[PDB]
Design a protein that fits this description.
This is part of a larger assembly, with chains A (about 100 residues), B (about 100 residues), C (about 160 residues), D (about 80 residues) and E (about 190 residues). Chain A is mainly alpha-helical and about 100 residues long. Helices cover about 25% and strands about 5% of the residues of chain A. Chain C has two helices and five strands. Chain C has helices at about 25-30, 100-120, and strands at about 40, 65, 70-80, 85-90, 95. In chain C, strand 2 (about 65) and strand 3 form a beta hairpin. The chains are: A mainly alpha (about 100), B mainly beta (about 100), C alpha+beta (about 160), D mainly alpha (about 80), E alpha/beta (about 190). Chains in contact: A-C, C-D. Bound molecules: zinc ion. The site of zinc ion (ZN) has 8 residues of chain B, from loops. Chain C binds five RNA strands through strand 3, strand 4 and helix 2. Chain E: This is Large ribosomal subunit protein eL18.
Chain lengths: ~100, ~100, ~160, ~80, ~190
RNA sequence: GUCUACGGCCAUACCACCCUGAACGCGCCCGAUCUCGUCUGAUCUCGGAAGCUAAGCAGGGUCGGGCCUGGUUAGUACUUGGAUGGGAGACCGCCUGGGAAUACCGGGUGCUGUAGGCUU
RNA sequence: GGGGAGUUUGACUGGGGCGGUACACCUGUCAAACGGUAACGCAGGUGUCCUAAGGCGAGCUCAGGGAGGACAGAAACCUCCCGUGGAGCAGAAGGGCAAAAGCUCGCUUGAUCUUGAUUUUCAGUACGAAUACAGACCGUGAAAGCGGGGCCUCACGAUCCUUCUGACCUUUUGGGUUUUAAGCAGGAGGUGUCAGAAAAGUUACCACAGGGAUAACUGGCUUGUGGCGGCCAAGCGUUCAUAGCGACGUCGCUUUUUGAUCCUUCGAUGUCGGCUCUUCCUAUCAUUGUGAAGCAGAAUUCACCAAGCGUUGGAUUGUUCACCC
RNA sequence: CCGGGCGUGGAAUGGAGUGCCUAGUGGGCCACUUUUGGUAAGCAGAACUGGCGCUGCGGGAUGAACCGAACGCCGGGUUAAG
RNA sequence: UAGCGGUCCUGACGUGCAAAUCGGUCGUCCGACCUGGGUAUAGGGGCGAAAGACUAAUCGAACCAUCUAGUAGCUGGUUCCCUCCGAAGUUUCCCUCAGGAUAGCUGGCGCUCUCGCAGACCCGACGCACCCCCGCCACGCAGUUUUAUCCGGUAAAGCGAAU
RNA sequence: GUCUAACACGUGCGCGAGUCGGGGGCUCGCACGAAAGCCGCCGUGGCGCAAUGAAGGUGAAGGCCGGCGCGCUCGCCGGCC
């Protein structure tokens, strides 16, 4: 306070960004291409500084890429289950389930 | 702490381990005279002054207890002195604790 | 910040690495140390009796005393700008040999054998360790194709 | 009053101005701190070495003759 | 500007050093010529010593001279000293030999001439032999003086063995603490 | 091939489950007077040798987990050294050298000293 | 026995014995992959405790979970299975440990006597603490071995003086004997300002040496707090986001507030407010010229160019500030 | 421990080793990079290296530190930062 | 009113007429009044209708002389020329923080060897000279890279790896 | 700013197992001299050649080997270095 042992005490709580972070991801129907960026550009005016906006090259919040994702799902290596899709390698001990029905 | 009254250990005069009886130490008073006390008196003598510096700012709350060992061999009178780490309580040869049966 | 403490900042140093928290494998006990071969000092943690101080964790120096189950070691401690040749005791669980000298001894043996063989053949070969010279002039055969055309990648965004 | 605390940086050049760097090595050195049992025993060996010369040299005149002859007798 | 460092520019081993009375100065004016124009490293070293100060040319005790000249292979050779020769009373055997030193004490000179040897002054030596020709060269001990037992590791360190400066040797002078573990600690 | 006692490395040796068994080799297994110790001959200890390899143990199987070792991750992240390089800043590019770790995709799944057997 | 006298009345310190020990200590971190390292930097602990919580030797495995069993239940006690330290190691935290360093027993005092060496902090001085050997007496275990305090890192102390134990010790003054005294060794009595003075205030009656190395003013750097705006636009404005405003956010400016700092003067810059006088700035209360409006007129509100010219008379306080006719 | 036989081993530099006596200092400051306290400070506190201190010259107009740069007295030529 | 005082102008002068005076306006002016001379009280002492006032232009302890040049970690200064070398502001301890001690950094005096006056002869996987070193240690060192072998746990990265 | 005296330390200059006129004394000779020269003084004595103990005190080298003493640890003459 009078600097005779000055050291602050907790107040507020922030998050640290990194060049290339992803502060907000919106998912919707492809028809809403110009609603997504239109709305999301507002957040550029609430956050400090400049933040490039961007349209993902992925199906959703998945690890995956352009819509060959769904081809892979047809191949059954990707299982639609929950807000994301569960990956499946060809490892594992179900070499009788993959027989009975893959 | 606590220590039993009788324990065997090296009796220097004997030359071997022998049993010893332990009595905890307490200070003396004056030989009858001692030239320290004698000069201190003749220095206090005369008009004025407290010559040798009295000691008032105390800071220690326990004295280094000391055990006095007596031999027991007939005509091995010897008595030898030994120390122990500090302590805020002391007992001697008291009631020993058996465990595994303790009730609050 | 703190000052004197026999083991400061040895939370990770003496820590029995990242899976081997077991008892001491016995070969470290069973190794034969002699008077005057270069050990090196890496402190363990399980021994609990006789550790070198953390100033000597990693240094390496001659050995000059051999007790029952702990050797003395002469190592160079760095202090203010003088360098001291200090002597210590270390339980043998913290020391180990150091190939630094052993490789030199092997190459000594090959040098002397080569000298003897030069005695036998009359020809003076080059004795050890001429340092690494620059490259020689060699022909690169290109039969198989004409070289690959290599060209920069245009920018793309992967957030 | 108030004083300003230290700052410790020039004491790195201070040494190297002309500071030595080696412990002044030497050949065989002072047996101070060796295992005293070994010390006693090795001393007995030494005392009966520089005694026992009608032991030592009278049982090494043989090896003197032997090497001093053989080092040529290879020829 | 070069980056050399200058603190060792000048060598302190001085070249024409302290040379103050005319006899020694003239001896130097003689051996300088020999040092220049004779490859005899012996003359180099002898002249290099004719500069030193007396605390660096201690007196060659005659007993030392005897037991260093007796050694095998050193018969009929002049033994040369740059310091001076003081006779010893530790020796009863009359000498046997021939010297060549700057200054020799009267007792030692008496006993040498009685022995039937010779005394050679450096001019006599130079005209005898323009260089080291069968000449042994000695020196009185130069770690002899007292102050060396004062020098060294400062006393009070764990394993000095040096002599402090105290004004007597009585029991009460320094032997109080830092000397006997009955009084606080020992060296 | 393989086992037994002591081991060194201490997971390529662990864990799970199924199959296989080149002496009495280990072991299960039958008893408790002697030795011994427990509330219990379960354990420990002793004395045995009727059956047993059902178990341990050894070997094998596993689109096995684990573990070891490779790739892809990447010359990316990172940094020694340089500039009167950009930027208002936050940061960043370059010259020069060094150069990783996940996710993911391969491969492997005890070796071996010593003294001692057998080929069920 | 302050009637009278002598003297003392710690240091650190974002100015000042106010607060607090950063004054001896030890752990984790800062601390930048030797390893040293700073602040009244951050999270913490100590002035003890233990006849065993020491030393050996043997035997068992802990935390918790799952299925069962009369009372019995969420939890007593018994049994089976899973069980990589998830528990316990006297206490802070870190390290370390699974036929142990834990748990239970069994026996015991190596928690003893005696030289030297080394580490730890550093002048490579001591104290403290620790390392590894050697010479004795021992302990346990069949034995190999292990043990000279606590599983390791903290848990404690100089000269002088006092006190105790030690040898059939030396001296006790011309000699002898005996008391007593001084010696020599090892422990203890303590110095927490923890390398170790014995110590209460007040000076507005004050003094001398100094200090801008250090406060109280202006002046500088900063602008958190103070004041002035700007951006985004859910809403208020019956209808309507922007006539006029503006929340949740965010970017600046100004030095007309208050702080933070110590750079300049302590061998001196006269430090509140008021009175008188000049001049300056503009983010404009009024006036000249203009746009806008939820603007009919009248008033009034927002904004633009703009400091040429105005911005009062009094009650109350010293008032700056305020308040009222 | 005594005797015997074989010589020196990677580049680049250069003479090393050793003793005695001893004045001044123990108020620092700044900068590239790393880093703690703070909102930040021409603020407080740390590591490395270099400077200012103790030092002038050209250049940044002006200046303690920045850039170049290191000094006896001069003539000729050539540059660095500019 | 004289006499005695000395309120307000915060009037005058403020290197003054004056080391405290002047002009006006002010309180008292028969009582605890004003005043000359004599006499007493003396420095930790007197004297005080009490302000620490007065004690010779000095008083919360006068003046003079001596001890005496008291003492200082504190400011001030510390006198001729050139030449050579050239820092520290950090460690530890201190009633230590504007100071010393100690280390470090500094200069001076030197020393022990190198052996480049190294002929009229004659080599090193040891340097120098090279006639060649009988006389010769190329011995040694490094704020450096190289080749080996070691040590750590920051940057970076991870949570479908424990906390 | 060792200013001067007294210490002490080390370096340097000059005289040795010693060194030293240090205080006294002697020539009478006193301008120069309060000096200079001389000594059973030659040195009582300082400092040194000898340390250590608290103090009684003790205080600096062995080797070969002849025998007898069991060469037994060892001793006594031995001859020698
Ligand atoms: Zn006894």
């Amino acid at each position: 306070t009078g600097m005779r042992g000055a050291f602050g005490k907790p107040q507020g709580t922030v998050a640290r960004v990194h060049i290339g972070q992803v502060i907000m991801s919106i998912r919707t129907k492809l028809q809403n291409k110009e609603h997504v960026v239109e709305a999301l550009r507002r957040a550029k005016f609430k956050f400090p500084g400049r933040q490039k906006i961007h349209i993902s090259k992925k199906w959703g919040f998945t690890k995956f890429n352009a819509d060959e994702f769904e081809d892979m799902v047809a191949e059954k290596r990707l299982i639609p289950d929950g807000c994301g899709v569960k990956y499946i390698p060809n490892r594992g001990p179900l070499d009788k389930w993959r027989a009975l029905h893959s | 702490v606590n220590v039993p009254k009788t324990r065997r250990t090296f009796c220097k005069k004997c030359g071997k381990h022998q049993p010893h009886k332990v009595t905890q130490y307490k200070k003396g008073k004056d030989s009858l005279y001692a030239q320290g006390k004698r000069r201190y008196d003749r220095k206090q003598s005369g008009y004025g002054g407290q010559t040798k510096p009295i000691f008032r700012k105390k800071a220690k709350t326990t004295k280094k207890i000391v055990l006095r060992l007596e031999c027991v061999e007939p005509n091995c009178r010897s008595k030898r002195m030994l120390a122990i780490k500090r302590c805020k309580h002391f007992e001697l040869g008291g009631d020993k604790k058996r465990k595994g049966q303790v009730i609050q | 910040t703190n000052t004197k403490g026999k083991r400061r900042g040895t939370r990770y140093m003496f820590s029995r690495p990242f899976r081997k928290h077991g008892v001491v494998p016995l070969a470290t006990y069973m190794r034969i140390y002699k008077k005057g071969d270069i050990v090196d000092i890496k402190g363990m943690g399980t021994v609990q009796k006789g550790m070198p101080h953390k100033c000597y964790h990693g240094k390496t120096g001659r050995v000059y005393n051999v007790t029952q189950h702990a050797v003395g070691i002469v190592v160079n401690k760095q202090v203010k700008g003088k360098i001291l040749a200090k002597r210590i005791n270390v339980r043998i669980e913290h020391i180990k040999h150091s190939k630094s000298r052993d490789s030199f001894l092997k190459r000594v043996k090959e040098n002397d054998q080569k000298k003897k063989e030069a005695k036998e053949k009359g020809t003076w070969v080059q004795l050890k360790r001429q340092p690494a010279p620059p490259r020689e002039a060699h022909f690169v055969r290109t039969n198989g194709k004409e070289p690959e055309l290599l060209e920069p990648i245009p920018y793309e965004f992967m957030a | 009053a108030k004083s300003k605390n230290h700052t410790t940086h020039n004491q790195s050049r201070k040494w190297h101005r002309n500071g030595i760097k080696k412990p002044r090595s030497q050949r065989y050195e002072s047996l101070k701190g060796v295992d005293p049992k070994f010390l006693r025993n090795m001393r007995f060996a030494k005392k009966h070495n520089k005694k026992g010369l009608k032991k030592m040299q009278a049982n090494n005149a043989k090896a003197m003759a032997a090497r001093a002859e053989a080092i040529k007798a290879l020829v | 500007g070069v980056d050399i460092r200058h603190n060792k520019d000048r060598k302190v081993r001085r070249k024409e050093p302290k040379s103050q009375d005319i006899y020694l100065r003239l001896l130097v004016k003689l051996y300088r010529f020999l040092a220049r124009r004779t490859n005899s490293t012996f003359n180099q070293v002898v002249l290099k010593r004719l500069f030193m100060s007396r605390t660096n040319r201690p007196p060659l005790s005659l007993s030392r001279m005897i037991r260093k000249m007796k050694l095998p292979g050193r018969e009929n050779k002049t033994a040369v000293v740059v310091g001076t020769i003081t006779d010893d009373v530790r020796v009863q055997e009359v000498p046997k030999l021939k010297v060549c030193a700057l200054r020799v004490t009267s007792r030692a000179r008496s006993r040498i001439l009685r022995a039937g040897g010779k005394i050679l002054t450096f001019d006599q030596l130079a005209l005898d032999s323009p260089k080291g020709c069968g000449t042994v060269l000695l020196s009185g001990p130069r770690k002899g003086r007292e102050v060396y037992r004062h020098f060294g590791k400062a006393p009070g360190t764990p394993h000095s063995h040096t002599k402090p400066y105290v004004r007597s040797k009585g029991r009460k002078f320094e032997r109080a603490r830092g000397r006997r573990a009955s009084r606080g600690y020992k060296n």
